[PDB]
C-alpha cells in the first residue's frame, strides 16, 4: 500500500481504518484535538484537514487507497486550522496559571506552537457552570466538549451522571438540571478527571490545609497508600523504584511530619478482620454473597443502586479509615496526647477516599486526604531531588505490612490477602482461577475441612451490573471501581491510561516481591495490636466496623 | 404519586426508543417537564437523569419552565421576520417585560419564537393560546396585550 | 380490498360511483389547511355545519386541503357549480347557503380577483394563475377529501400500489424509478433510483423506510401542505418503496408542532390498516409492512439523515461522519431508506404513468414538477406547483401576481438558510438542478421568499445566521463556534460598529465554516453571507461607512424634532445627557445630533414631536 504524501512515497499498513491513524503509525503526525485519551472518538475538532483530489476533508474519516495523493500542509489548510484553534481559544477560559492541566495540556501546547498571540474573535459570554461541591471539581469554561468524560462515566464506569445538554453554542457537559455533583449518583471515582484533557474536570486541592496544619503546634501524622508509591515517580520523569515509599517518608520527615505510617498495615488489619467475617458467614451461610467494602466508590455505588445488598457489604471499614481510627483511638492514647492534637494526613491515589474521610460515619478521623498529584506537587514545590534522598523506614508501630497487604493497590489484592489469611488459618487445598471476561476473575476455593466457595474479582465499575445479573454462585465479590484497581485511581498522575496502569501494577508487584512477611498473621505488630487494644468483639466492632445507609433523591 | 406518568409509560412500555413521545405527552399533561417527573421517569425507565435531561434540552418543544396562562408564539420565519416580527418582539418586551423563552414571576404570560406557521399571508404573525393574530405592528400587539391584561384585571 | 385485487377493484368502482354522485350533488368543500385555518376556516366549517343542520338540508360537507390561494382567505367550493368563494366570512355564511346551495345564483363579491385584470373569475380552473401552473402532484384541487381514504380510492388512488404489488416485482419498480429521472426533492437532488438500488442491495433481511416530513427551512410549508391535503399519496409511495427495497417497517417523521399533519397522517395509517393495505399481509402477496408516525420534538438539524435516525431512536439529533451511509446501516444499524415527502408522493404518480409520460414534464435532467411555497409582500402567495423549467420571474409575476402596491423586487431566497440569494440577474433562468449548481445556487427544499427594496441584505444574513447558530447541534468546532462568531460580526455590522477588518474576518471565517463543518447544516451555514457578499457587497461597504441603503437597520434612524410639529415649550434644555437642545425659547426649537449618542430619550416630554 503506497501513498503519496506531499509528493513523496510513503508505505502504510494494508488494513487501516483512516488515513490519519495510518500516517500516525508510519510516524507522520497531523495536528488534531480529537485523540486526547483512550476514550476519544474522531470527528469533532475538524483540524485534521487534508487535500485529496483537489478537495479538503478530514483525514480521520477517510479510507486510504492505493496511489492516493494527499497534501497535509497547504495555505488553505493552514488558514483553516489556525481559524479553528482561534475559535476554540476565543471562548476558552485562558487562565493556565491556576489550571490543573498547566504543562500537560494539548490545547496550551497548540496555542504555543501555532503562534496565537491575540484573540481575533471575541470571547462571547457563555452560561458557564462552576461546581466545587465534591472532591471532583467541574469548570465548564475550560471544556472543549470532546465528550471523553461522558463516555468514560457511561460506558466504562456505568454510572452516566454527566451528559451533553442543550445544543449549539450553549452546548455543555453537566449533571441533570446542573445539580451539584455531590448531590447526584456520582461515585467520585475520578475516572472522568483521569481522562479529561483540560482543567474542566479537576481534583479539589487541599495543600493549603496541610501547610496550615504543619505550621501549627499539633502532631501531624501521615500515612501512604500502597498504590501511591508505585505511581508517584511519573511526575518526576524517572524510572521506577522499590525505595520510593521510604524516600517519601524521608521527605515528609524533612517537611515536618511527626510520624509517617504505612496504610498497608491498615490493609493487613482489614484483610484479617474481613477474612474472619467471611469465614463466619460461610459457616452460618448468612448474608451471602459478601461484598468487599474497601473501595469507597463501590460503597457509594451500592448505596445508590443496590440498597438490598447493603447488608451483604462487609462491615469492615477501608484500610484508610481503619488505620486512622486505630491511630486516633489507640495510638493517641499510647502517645500521651489528646485525640484533638493529632492532624492525620492520608496520601491516597483516589478521589473517592476524600469523600469517605468526610462521611458522617468517619467524620473527624482523617483530617485531610491528599492525592498522588498533591504529594508530587509538595515534593516539586520543595525542589528536593527525590532521586537522591536517602530512604528511611516507616515509623513504628504501623510501618510494616505483609506483601499481600501491600498488594491492595492493584485489583485482586484484597481477595488475595483474604485467601492468604484463610490459608494460614485453615488452609486452601487448591484454587482454580478463571477469566470470564476482561476485568473479571472467578476463583473456586476448597478448604481443608470441605466447605468450598467461589470468589470473584471485578475491577472497573460497570462490569458489576451484568456480573451480578447473570451469576448467583459466587460467595465473595471484590469490586474495585477503577480499572486495574487503585493503581489507576482518579488521583493518580496524568496521563492515566491502560499501559501506564499496567506499568504501575508491575512496579507494585516488584515492590511486593522484596517484602519478607508473607501473611498478616506473620505481622507481629498487627498481632500485638490485637492482643493489646483489640481483644474483645466490642472494641473490635467500635474501631474496625462501620454501617451503610441507602441513598436516594426526592 | 405519578399515576398518569405510569399510564403514559406503560402505554409506551418503558421503551427507550419511545422517550421523545413519552416526554411530549408528559409535557402536554404538565405544561412543562418538572424535575421530579424526570427523576421518576428515570428510575422507572432505567435511564440516568442526565441522559433524559440532555434529550429534553436538545429539542425546542420541551421546556424546563412552566408555560403561562396565556402562551405567546411569535413567528420568526423569513416572511414574518421581513414583515416586522422584531417590532412585535420589541413591543411584547416593552409591554410584558419578558424576552422570548421566558415567563413572568406571576406566570401570567410566556413568549416563544417559532418557525413558519404556514400562514405567511398574515405576516407578521402571532398566536396566543391558539388564536392567530396576523398583520401585526407595535401598536396592535400592545393593544392586544393590554386588553388581555384588562380582561384579567376584571375577573380577579 | 383485503386479500385479492378483484375485490379491491369492485370496492374502488363502487367508491368511484359514489364520488360521481357526490360531484353531481350539491357539496360544500372548505379549505381547512394551514393558512386558511389561521384566517378562520374552522369557524366557517362550523358555520356551514350549524346552518345545514338548523335548516335540515343530503348536501355533503367535506373538509379539503390547500388549494394554492392561501392568501385569499378561507376557500369554499360549490360542487355542481364550481364557484370558489374566497375571503369568506362566518357572518356571510347564511347568504352563501341560501343564495347558492338552493337557488344557485353566484355571489359575485365573494369571487377570486385576478391581480392582472382585477376581475372576479367564476372559477380557478379558468384563471391565469391556474393556467400558468403545472399540476402533477397537486390534484383534485378544492374537491378532495383529506380525512378519508374513500375519496382517495375513488380518485384512482392506490391503484399503483395494487398493480406494483401484484404485477411488478421490486426490481422492475426500482428500474422504472431509475428511468423516470426522479431526483430527490429534499434539496440534495440525488437520483431516487440509485438510492433505492443501494438500500435494496444492502445485505440483510431487516430494513426500514423512513419519510422525512421536515421542510429543511424555517420559512417553508409545502411539505406540510402536501402531508395535510393528501397523506394517502405519501403513504402509498412509502408502501411502494417498502416493497421495492424489501423493507418491513416504515417511519413517518412529522414535527410535533404540526398537529393537523400528524393527526391526518395517523388517521390515514389507521384507515389503511383497517382496509388491509397495511398489516401482516397485503393482497395475499406475502409482503408485510406497518407504518409509525414518529413525532419530531423539533430540531432543524434533525433534517440531516444521521441526525434524523438518531432522533428516531430517542437520542439527541446529532449527526455523525457519513461512512457508513444510512442506506447500509441506519436505524439500529440496519439498511434504511430516507426520502422526502415530495419524493414519495412522486412514486405512485410514476407508477401510474410510464417513464416517458413522466419525462414529458420538466427538463431532460429534471423531469416532473416541483411544489413551491412563495412568501413576502406579494399579490398571490401560497403553495404552487410548476415544471422544472419555469423561471423565477414567471413564478413571481405570472403565478403570484407580482408585488403589492408599494413594493418592488430586490432579491429572492430560494432555499432558506441553506439556499441562496438571487438578485435581478438570476430570475431569468429556468429552475433546474443542474443549471443552479454552476450559478452558485440550488433549487432548495421548495421555499421561495421575495425581498423588496425596504429590506436590508445585511439584516437578511444576520437573520439567517441567527437561526443557524441557534440550530447548530454543537458537535463540531467549525459550526458551533464559527456560526456564533459570524453572527456576532453581523450584529456589529447592523449596529454601525463594523470595520473592514470585520469584513475580511467574516469572509475567511465563512470559508472555514463552509469547508470544515461536519454535516450539511454547518457546510451551508455561511451560504447567506457568501451570496449576499457576492451580490450585495456595496450594502456591506455602506454599513461600514455608517449608513444603511434601506431604512430598516434601527441602529441609525436619527431622531429629529419637527419644527412645524414642535410646540416650543422649551423643556428640552438640560433634559438630555448631551444637552444638545439648542432650541429657541418661545417658538419652535431645533435639535442637533452632533453630540447625541442616539440613546432614545427624545420621546420623554414632547407632543409626539420626536420620531424614532
Ligand atoms: C440541516 C439540514 C436539514 C435538512 N432538512 C431536510 C428536510 O427537511 N427534508 C428533506 O427531505 N431533506 C432534508 N435535508 C436533506 C437530508 O439530509 C436528505 O438528503 C434528504 O432527507 C433525502 O431526501 P431526498 O432523497 O428525497 O432528497 C436536510 C439536510 C440538512 C443538512
Ligand atoms: S485547559 Fe488549562 S492549561 Fe489548557 S489551555 Fe485551558 S487554561 Fe490553559
Ligand atoms: S467521578 Fe466517576 S461517577 Fe462521578 S462523573 Fe466522574 S466518572 Fe462519573
Ligand atoms: S469536561 Fe473534559 S473530558 Fe468532558 S467534554 Fe469537557 S474537555 Fe472533554
Ligand atoms: S478502585 Fe481504588 S482508586 Fe479507584 S475508586 Fe476504588 S479505592 Fe479509589
Ligand atoms: S456542522 Fe453544526 S449541526 Fe453539523 S455536526 Fe457540526 S455542529 Fe452539528
Ligand atoms: S421638549 Fe420637545 S416639544 Fe418642548 S421645546 Fe423641546 S423639542 Fe419642543
Ligand atoms: S436621543 Fe438621547 S442622547 Fe440623543 S438628543 Fe435625545 S435624549 Fe439626548
Ligand atoms: S481528528 Fe478531529 S475531526 Fe479529524
Ligand atoms: S413565515 Fe411566519 S407564518 Fe410563515
Ligand atoms: S390552505 Fe387554503 S388555499 Fe392553501
Ligand atoms: Zn442595513
Author numbering:
A (entry chain A): 1 to 554
B (entry chain C): 4 to 159
C (entry chain B): 1 to 57, 70 to 624
What does the paper say about this structure?
The heterotrimeric [FeFe] hydrogenase, HydABC, from T. maritima is a soluble cytoplasmic enzyme involved in fermentation. It uses electrons from the one-electron carrier ferredoxin (E°′ ≈ −450 mV Schut and Adams, 2009), which is reduced during pyruvate metabolism, and the two-electron carrier NADH (E°′ ≈ −20 mV; Schut and Adams, 2009), produced during glucose metabolism, to reduce protons to hydrogen (E°′ ≈ −420 mV; Schut and Adams, 2009). The electron-bifurcating [FeFe] hydrogenase from Thermotoga maritima (HydABC) requires both NADH and ferredoxin to reduce protons generating hydrogen. Electron bifurcation is a fundamental energy conservation mechanism in nature in which two electrons from an intermediate-potential electron donor are split so that one is sent along a high-potential pathway to a high-potential acceptor and the other is sent along a low-potential pathway to a low-potential acceptor.
